[PDB]
Amino acid sequence: IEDLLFNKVTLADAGFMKQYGECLGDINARDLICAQKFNGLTVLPPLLT
Amino acid sequence: NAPATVCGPKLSTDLIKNQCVNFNFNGLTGTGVLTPSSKRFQPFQQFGR
């Protein structure tokens, strides 16, 4: 039952790591996360996994 | 805002890529890293935003 619930909600960022090289290697796509990171906005992971 | 043909006296240098440098492009100054681009500029376009 927990499998169905998790698939029913769309999440933006699967993880909480975004390497510097990856943003530069993906410049063509206007990724929303890379734009936030380059402007000093950060999202922190929850303590409990 | 657009291509220019009248410029002040100043010596140019060689392009340095994949490194954080101070740049000056036709009078526009800043700091950043330069990498090759796949964008397609029309003849009357000089800058992208």
Q: Do B35 and A28 touch (CB under 8 A)?
A: no
> Using CA atoms, how far apart are residues A11 and A33, in angstroms rounded to an integer?
13
User: Looking at chain B, how many residues does it have?
Assistant: 49
Are B2 and B44 in contact, with CB atoms under 8 Å apart?
A: yes
Q: Do B38 and A24 touch (CB under 8 A)?
A: no
Output phi, psi for A20, to 5 deg: -60, -45
- Cβ neighbours of A24 in B, within 8 Å: 33, 35
Resolution (A): 2.7
Cα dihedral B19, B23, B25, B27 in deg (nearest 10): 170
Are B29 and B42 in contact, with CB atoms under 8 Å apart?
A: no
End-to-end Cα distance, chain A: 18
Are A15 and A43 in contact, with CB atoms under 8 Å apart?
A: no
By what technique were these coordinates determined?
A: cryo-EM
**Among all chains, which residue has been given the structure tokens 């929850």?**
A46
Are A32 and A18 in contact, with CB atoms under 8 Å apart?
A: no
SS3 A26: coil
A&B contacts, CB < 8 Å: 5
**Total Cβ atoms within 10 A of residue A27:** 13
Output phi, psi for A6, to 5 deg: -70, -35
